[PDB]
Amino acid sequence: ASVHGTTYELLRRQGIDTVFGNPGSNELPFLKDFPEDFRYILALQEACVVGIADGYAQASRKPAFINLHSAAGTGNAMGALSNAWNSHSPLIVTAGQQTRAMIGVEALLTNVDAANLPRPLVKWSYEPASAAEVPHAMSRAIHMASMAPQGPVYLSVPYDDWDKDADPQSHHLFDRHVSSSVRLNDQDLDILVKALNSASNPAIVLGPDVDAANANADCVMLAERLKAPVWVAPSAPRCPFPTRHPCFRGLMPAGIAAISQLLEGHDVVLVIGAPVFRYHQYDPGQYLKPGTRLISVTCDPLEAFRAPMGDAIVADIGAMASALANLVEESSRQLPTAAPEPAKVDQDAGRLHPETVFDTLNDMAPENAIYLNESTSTTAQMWQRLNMRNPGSYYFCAAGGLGFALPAAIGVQLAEPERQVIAVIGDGSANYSISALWTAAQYNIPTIFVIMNNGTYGALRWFAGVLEAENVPGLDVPGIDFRALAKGYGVQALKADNLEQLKGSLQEALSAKGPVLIEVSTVS
Amino acid sequence: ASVHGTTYELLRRQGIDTVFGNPGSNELPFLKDFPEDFRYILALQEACVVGIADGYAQASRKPAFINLHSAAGTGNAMGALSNAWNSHSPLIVTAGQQTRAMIGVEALLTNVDAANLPRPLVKWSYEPASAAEVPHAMSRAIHMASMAPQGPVYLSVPYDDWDKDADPQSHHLFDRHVSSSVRLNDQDLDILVKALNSASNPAIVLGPDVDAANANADCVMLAERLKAPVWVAPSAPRCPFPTRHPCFRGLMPAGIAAISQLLEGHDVVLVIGAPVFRYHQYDPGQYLKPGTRLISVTCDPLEAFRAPMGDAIVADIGAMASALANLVEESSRQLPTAAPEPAKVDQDAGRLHPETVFDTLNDMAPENAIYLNESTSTTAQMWQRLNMRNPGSYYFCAAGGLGFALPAAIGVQLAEPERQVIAVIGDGSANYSISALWTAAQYNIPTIFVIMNNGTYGALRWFAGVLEAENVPGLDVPGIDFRALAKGYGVQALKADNLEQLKGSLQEALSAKGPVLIEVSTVS
Amino acid sequence: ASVHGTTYELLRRQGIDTVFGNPGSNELPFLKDFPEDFRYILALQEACVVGIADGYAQASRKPAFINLHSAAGTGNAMGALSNAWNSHSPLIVTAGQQTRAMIGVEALLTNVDAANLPRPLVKWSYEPASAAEVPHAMSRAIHMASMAPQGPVYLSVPYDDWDKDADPQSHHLFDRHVSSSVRLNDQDLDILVKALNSASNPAIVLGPDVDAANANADCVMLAERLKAPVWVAPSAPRCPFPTRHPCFRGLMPAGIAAISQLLEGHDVVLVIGAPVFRYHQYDPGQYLKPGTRLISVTCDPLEAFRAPMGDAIVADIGAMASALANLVEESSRQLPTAAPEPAKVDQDAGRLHPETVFDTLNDMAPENAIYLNESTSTTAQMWQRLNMRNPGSYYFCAAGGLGFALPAAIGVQLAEPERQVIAVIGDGSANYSISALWTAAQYNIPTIFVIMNNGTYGALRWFAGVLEAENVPGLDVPGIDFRALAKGYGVQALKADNLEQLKGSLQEALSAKGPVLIEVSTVS
Ligand SMILES: Cc1ncc(C[n+]2csc(CCOP(=O)(O)OP(=O)(O)O)c2C)c(N)n1
Ligand SMILES: Cc1ncc(C[n+]2csc(CCOP(=O)(O)OP(=O)(O)O)c2C)c(N)n1
Ligand SMILES: Cc1ncc(C[n+]2csc(CCOP(=O)(O)OP(=O)(O)O)c2C)c(N)n1
Ligand SMILES: [Ca+2]
Ligand SMILES: [Ca+2]
Ligand SMILES: [Ca+2]
Ligand SMILES: [Ca+2]
C-alpha cells in the first residue's frame, strides 16, 4: 500500500469522512484519487476553512479534518486557531510541504521551521522525518486532537511522501482506541459529594466543556438535586444549560470583583467545564469573598494550574457530571425561582433596537434553533432574550477573535441539518470571514445570517467611552452593502429597516430552501 | 507582604521545604532572609543540582524545588532535564533573571527569550510580566509539575521582583489542592475487567510510573489474580515489581521484533505505567504477532498518542492499578513458576566480572537497599542478579543521559535516610557529574558509589562491534584515579582489585558513617 | 559516494580537520571510518567538549566542529553555548539522532523537537528532512557559523543517514566561499572620518570582536592618530588592545552612570566591536552626559538595534578598523600619557593576596603568554596587573557562565602551541568543568591552571554585602583538594601557600612538559 492509501484508511477507520480545505500544489498528491466515501468542503480563504471545520467539530462532538496550503494557508488560519484553542475544538490541521529534496534550498512554497508556525495555538505540531512515518504521525494527530482536553493539532507533510510505500505494520494504527473518559477515584469523589451535600447555599457555574460533553442534562439533574442556582461562566463560548430552567441565572459578568460579589453568601461554588475564570474587563477586587469556597472540575491541566483560587479536579466533564448528578442527595431546600421575563424595550417604527431583534428571533425561530453570536455590543441582551432549551444551541468566538461565527454557522448547519442555524453578526464582524458565504451557497447549507448593521464597531466605541478615550481612530465602518456582498457570493439577500420588515424577512428566511442573509438596520 | 514572603509562604503551604541550588547574583534577592524552616542543598554544578533534586523527587514521590543562575546555570542543567522529562519527575526549576530595567539592553546575566531556553524538555516555561504576578506564576509551576503526567517546569524571575509588594489576594493560592487522581469510568472499566477475566493467557508489562505511584503492591495482587507473567518495560528507569516474585520475568529487550516474539501466544497484554515502547536498538519486525492484543494504561497523553499499536487509557496509575487489582477475578490457572537463579560466572583471583560484583552486592547489601545504575554495558546482568523486594529500589537515567546516577544517588539517599543507597556507575559515566561527590561529603549523605572501572566506554565498543564499525575514535578513557577524585571532594575512598578486596571494601563501606567510593577493577 | 564521504569531504574542503566530541551510539555511524587526516579530541562531559572547542575557535579565529550525543549531550553543553553566543564563537555543533524509522515512537535516544532544544542560544538550528540533504545542511551550518556576526549553530542528524547515497550534485558545495568582509560605503565613511577628525576630545571603546578580527594593531594606529584614550568595553570577553600602550585606560566599569561619567567631556566616543553596553550591576543614571555623542561599529544587528543611545554601523570589524586607521588625520594633540604602574599590595609570609599572584604572573610569564580569567572577585586587579602586549592574550566567559575557562584554556593551548596558556580560576569556578583536566593530560596539552583557593564564592559574598543581604545560603565551598582532583585526571599538581612557594611552583610549571595545576592559598 501507498502512504496515501494507508492514511485514508486510517482516517476512515477513525471515523473521519470529511475534509475541509482550500487546496494548493503541495496538497495535490494528497487530494488526488480522493476517496469516493469522503467529501471535500471547499472554502475560499483559510480562516473560513478552519471556522467551518470548527463549527462542525463543536456541534458534531467529534474531530474535524482540515487541509491547508503550506505556510501561507496555515498563516491565514491562525486567528481561527486562536478561537479553536480556547473552545477545546478537536481539529486535525494538515498542511502540505514542498518535496523533501527542495526543502533545504527553500524553494517557493517551502514551509520553513513548519512545526513552530502554529505554536502556541496547538496541542502538538509536527513534520515527519520520513514518508513511512506519515500514517503514524497522522495517528498521533487524530488521538491528540481527541484526547481531553481536546484541541487543534498540526501536521505538515512533504508532498512526495504520499506516493511512497507505507510500512505494512501501520495496520496496527487503524483500530486503536484511546480513552480519557475518567473520573475522580471513589474515595475522593465521596469526599466531594459529602461537601456538596453539606453545603448550606451551593451555587453552580458551568462552562463550554459541559456542552461539548453533552453533560447538560446531568448538570440539570445536579442543580435540581442541590437546589442550586446555575450561572454560565464568563465570556461563554457555548450554552451549557436550558436558559429558562428555574435554576438558571444567566451569564456571569467577566470581572473579578463582580464575580466575587455575585457569589457572596454561597458557601460552596462548584465550577464544571470552565476556566476559573475567563475574565475580560479589568475589575480588580477579591477573587472570592470570605465564606465562599470554590471547587473546579476541568478537563484541562492548563485551566486547573492557573486558577487564582479554589481546589481543582482534572477529569472528563461527561464522566464527572454524570457521577455527581447520580450520587448527590436530594436537598429539601426550595428549588430556585425562575428569572422573570425580560422587559420589552420601547420600539418605534424606525431602526431596530437589538433587544427587539432578539425578542423577535425568540418568537419566530424553532425551539431547536441554534444561535451563533458575533454581535459584540449586544451579548448580554442576547443571553437574556433567547430561550435555548437544548444542548448545542449557542456559539461565540471562544478567544474573542472575530471572523468565527459566519463560517462556524455553516459548519454547525452542516453538522445539524435538522436544526435551523441563525447567526447574529455585527456589521463589523461580518467582514472578517465574508467569503465563507460562498460555501453556504455552493453546498446549499441553509444557514440564516442576521447582520446587525449600525455602521460602527459598537463594542469598541463603548469601551472608548468607559476609558474616556478621545480621538480614537478607526471605529466606524460606514458604506457596506451586505445585500450586495450576499449577491456576490450567491446567497439570497433581504433587508429589514423596521420591525414589520424584520418579521417579513424572518418569515421568508425560515421557509427558504437555501442560505439567506438579512441585513437589519439597528440603532447606533 | 513582599513577593519574597508570599512566595515562601506559598511554597511552605504546598509542602516544599528544601531548595536544591547553585547560587548567583540574580538569585541573591530570592535567597536572602532564607527561611529558617527551609534547607538549602548546594551542589557545585547545575547538572549535579538537578540530578540530586531529581533523585530526591523520585524517591520522595513529591515535587522538588530547584534554584539556578540565569541562562548559563539553566543551560548547564539541560541534560539533566532530558532525563527528568522521561522519568516524569516533578521538578520546579526556577532561575533568576536580570532586573527588569536592564533586560532590554541585554546586560550581562540577562536570560534572553528565557521561556524558550528549556523547551522542549519542560511541561511549562514562563517569565512573569510583573512582580505581583510572581506568586501566581509559582502556583502555576507547583501544580503543573505535580499534575499527571508529572514533569519538570521552569520559571524565570527578574531579581528586582522579590522586594516588591505582593497582591494581598495571593493568599487564595496558599491552600489550593489540585487532583489528577482519576480512573476510567465504571462502564468502561467493567469492560476492561471482563477482557482481563476472559483472557486465556494474559501478560502484564509494567513501567516506571507504577513505582512512581507506589502501585507496586497492587500490581503484585493483579498479577497473582490473573496468574500472569510480569515484565518490566524496556529501558527501565525504575523497578515496578519484586524481582524474585514467581510472576517476574525481568527486563524486556528494547527491540520491536524481540518484544513481539516475547509476547507471542499472549492473547491480552496489559501495559501499565510505561510508554509503548521505549525501544532502543533497531530491531525491525512486527509490533505484535497475530493473536496478541495490547491495552495500555498511561498517565501521559504523549505516551498514549504515539503507541504504534493497542488501545490506551489515560488515567492515574495508582488509581487504576488499585481498581484493577481489586476488581478482577481470581483465575484458577496455575501461578507462574519463579525464574531460576542466575548462573555463577567463573571468577579467578584477578579483575572482577560484573556478574561477580552484582552477586556480591546482592549477598551483602541490606534487603531494603536502593540501587542506581549507570554502568551501561552491564544492565541486563544487574537486573538478573539483584533481588529487589521493595518499591523505590532502582533508578536508571530515563533518557539514557549520563551524569544522572551519581547526583541522583545523593538525592535518593537524602530522601530515604534509613535505606542504604548503592550507585553502580561505570568509569566513563562517573565523570559527567563527578563534582556531585562534594555534596555527599558536605551534608554527610552516606551514599555508596561503586565505580566499575574497565578503562573504556564499554557499551559503545560493543555497539561499534555490532555495526562492524572500524576506526571509531574516543572510546577509551584510560588514566582516571577515582580514589583521588573522591579525596578531592572529601569522600572516603577504597579500592577493589579482586573479589576478596571487593568483599572487604563493601564490608567497610556498609559500616561507614559517611559516603564511600569504591573503585572496582572490572574486566575489559 | 555516501553521505558520510561527501560530508567529510565538504568539511575538509572548508578547512575543518578536528572534531571535538563526546561519543554516543547515534554518532557511531558518523565517527566510523574516521578520516586519517582528521583528529578527534575527546572530553569527558559536554560542557567540557564545547568549552575546549570554543577556546580553540576563538584563538584560531576559525570555526570549530563539535559532535555531541542526542538531547542529553546537547543539553549538557547548553551553558557552554550561552557563553559562545555572547563571544560570537563560530561553533558548528552537531548531534546524532535516532534512526528515522524510530523517531515517531520516541525510542530511547530520540532527540524530540530537536531544532528547538538549543534555542535561543544558536544562530540556526535544524534537522534535515532526508539523508541526501545532510551535506547541504552541513554547508548551511558551516557558513552560518562563519558569517558575521559569527556564532554557534546546531545540526541534528539521524544516524541512518550517513550510509545512504549522497546526491552527486553536492559537489557544488565543496568550494563555496561566503564573504561578510564589508565596510561602510565611501560617502558615509567619509562623513564618519570627518566627524572623527573634527572631534576636540575623542575617546575610543573596544570590545571582543576587535580581538576576534585581529583588528588590534589597526585600533592602535587609530588611537595614535586621534590621540585618543582607549577603554575596553565592560564585562570584557577578550583583550583588544596592548594594556601598557600609552592610550590604554583599562576596563570600563559595567554600570550606566559610571560609564556616562567616565565619558563626560568626550565629544565623540567611537565604540568598535562591542555591544553598547554589556552593563552588569544596576547603576541607574544618564546613558551619556550632555555633550557626548556615541558612534558604534558592530558586526551584529542584535547589538546595533538594542543600544539605548548613539548611531550604529553594522559591518565587519576588521574591514572597518583598517579603513578608519588608514583614513583619519594625524591629530596634533598630545598623545595620552600612560597609566601609572599599579601599587604593590603589602604581602606577608602567609596566604596570597590576588594582587600578589597577578604581579608574580606578570613578572614570570613569557611576554606572549595567554591568560584566561574565571576568578570572579579579582577581575579588576587582573586587568590592571597583567601586561598583555599581543592579540589573543585574554579570555573571560562572555555570558558570565562559569565552567568556561578550564576547558577553554585547553582549546586555546591546542590552537597556540607556542604561547604558554595560564588559566587563573577560582576554587568555586574550577568545579563546573573539572573533568576537562583529563583532556589536557590525555593529549599532553601543556596548559597551566592556577586555582585561586579562598574557600568561598567570593564575588557572591561581596554582592550579598552590597545588598545588605543576610542569611544567604550556599556561599561557601570548603573541603576541596585540587591537587587530588588533578591527580585524579592525571595532571601534575603543585601547591603554593605563600609567595616563595608561588614563585617555586610557577618556575616548575613554566618548565614542565605537560599540563600543571597549582593550588594557591589566597586571602578570604
Ligand atoms: C480578529 C479581531 N480583530 C479585532 C477585534 C476587536 N473587536 C472587538 S469587538 C469589535 C467590534 C465589532 O463590531 P460589530 O461586529 O459591528 O459589533 P458591535 O460591537 O457594533 O455590536 C472589534 C473590531 C477582535 N476581537 N478580533
Ligand atoms: C550525556 C551523555 N553523553 C554520552 C552518552 C553516550 N554513552 C552511552 S553509554 C556510554 C559509555 C559509558 O561508559 P561507562 O560508564 O564506563 O560504562 P560501560 O559502558 O563501560 O559499562 C556513553 C559515552 C550518553 N548516553 N549520555
Ligand atoms: C554556571 C554558573 N553558575 C553560577 C554562577 C554564579 N557565580 C558568579 S561568581 C560565582 C563565584 C565563583 O567563585 P570563585 O570561582 O571561587 O571566584 P571568587 O568569586 O571567589 O573570586 C558564582 C557561583 C555563574 N556565573 N555561572
Ligand atoms: Ca508561531
Ligand atoms: Ca416573546
Ligand atoms: Ca456594529
Ligand atoms: Ca530550547
Ligand SMILES: [Ca+2]
Ligand atoms: Ca548469592
Ligand SMILES: [Ca+2]
Ligand atoms: Ca567503562
Ligand SMILES: [Ca+2]
Ligand atoms: Ca613587576
Ligand SMILES: [Ca+2]
Ligand atoms: Ca573563591
Ligand code: NA
Ligand atoms: Na476508585
Ligand code: NA
Ligand atoms: Na417605556
Ligand code: NA
Ligand atoms: Na463512573
Ligand code: NA
Ligand atoms: Na565454568
Ligand code: NA
Ligand atoms: Na562605496
Ligand code: NA
Ligand atoms: Na603599606
